[PDB]
């Protein structure tokens, strides 16, 4: 039943950036919308809007690929290279500011739902809070 909607949505993002789709139409929620707001703040994606089919509100994420590379297999390298729901339903992980992970030396980030809203790991270590470490995106 989209047993994790966030781990459905991030793999919709991944399964579409692998086939180089222009846009995803993920389902809608406030938590998924704040997660995608964090991703568009960081610069992985080109935002989202509010679409509908037969009475179903959505988010249409516009992906952001790279330049057409040279050599064989000239597909653009993707800014969402890896994306992984860490705190799954079957194992909810939570960390403090002492255990916030620098996601591969500060190239990628960690979306984490904190008590002071949904924050990137920079914002978590800056405001002091930890929380449920939702997904590492790098």
């Amino acid at each position: 039943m989209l047993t994790d909607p966030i781990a459905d949505m991030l793999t919709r993002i991944r399964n579409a950036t692998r086939v180089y789709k222009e846009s995803t139409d993920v389902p809608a929620s406030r938590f998924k919308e704040e997660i995608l707001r964090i991703l568009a703040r960081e610069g992985f994606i080109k935002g989202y809007e509010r679409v509908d089919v037969d009475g179903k509100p959505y988010l249409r994420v516009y992906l952001k690929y790279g330049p057409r590379r040279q050599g064989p297999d000239p597909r653009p390298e993707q800014v969402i290279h890896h994306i992984r729901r860490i705190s799954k339903p079957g194992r909810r992980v939570y960390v403090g500011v002492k255990e916030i992970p620098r996601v591969r030396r500060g190239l990628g980030i960690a979306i984490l739902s904190t008590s002071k809203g949904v924050l990137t790991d920079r914002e978590a270590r800056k405001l002091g809070v930890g929380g449920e470490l939702i997904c590492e995106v790098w």
Binding site: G43, K64, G66, V79, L107
Partner: protein, 150 residues
């Protein structure tokens, strides 16, 4: 010129009716210790033939690894089928802490301090191909902010 260090030399045998014809395989890397490696895998019926052919493919096929302070920008856990290699960059002054296969690939990229672990299968061919895939997957802060600045 480059430093031209070979990793494994193996003598693979096909069966002819009669003897069994051999074919010396040879996996050299070429590296200037500046940030450029090449993995050549020549298969020749003679051994200096194999080293020359492998050096030819290795200089023909290079990859620029974007180093920082003599070590690596980010942690990278890459895989080549069943052979998977992690590379955790080090604080400098640590040494190329790696296996005998990718120690030469990193040391001829001209890193100084890198912490790896040859996981999975440790086969010297597949680990070198995975390590070339790692150092071709290696990105730094400038060339990821270039892809985020839009």
């Amino acid at each position: 010129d480059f430093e031209e260090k070979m990793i494994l030399i193996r003598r693979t045998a096909r069966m002819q009716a009669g003897g069994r014809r051999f074919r010396f395989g040879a996996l050299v890397v070429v590296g200037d210790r500046q940030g450029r490696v090449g993995l050549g895998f020549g298969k020749a019926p003679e051994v200096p033939l194999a080293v020359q052919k492998a050096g030819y493919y290795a200089r023909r096929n290079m990859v620029e690894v974007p180093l920082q302070n003599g070590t690596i920008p980010h942690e990278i856990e890459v895989e080549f089928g069943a052979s998977k290699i992690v590379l955790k960059p080090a604080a400098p002054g640590t040494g190329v802490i790696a296996g005998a296969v990718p120690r030469a690939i990193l040391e001829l990229a001209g890193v100084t301090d890198i912490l790896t672990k040859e996981l999975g299968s440790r086969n010297p061919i597949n680990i070198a191909y995975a390590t070339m895939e790692a150092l071709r997957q290696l990105r730094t802060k400038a060339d990821v902010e270039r892809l985020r600045k839009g």
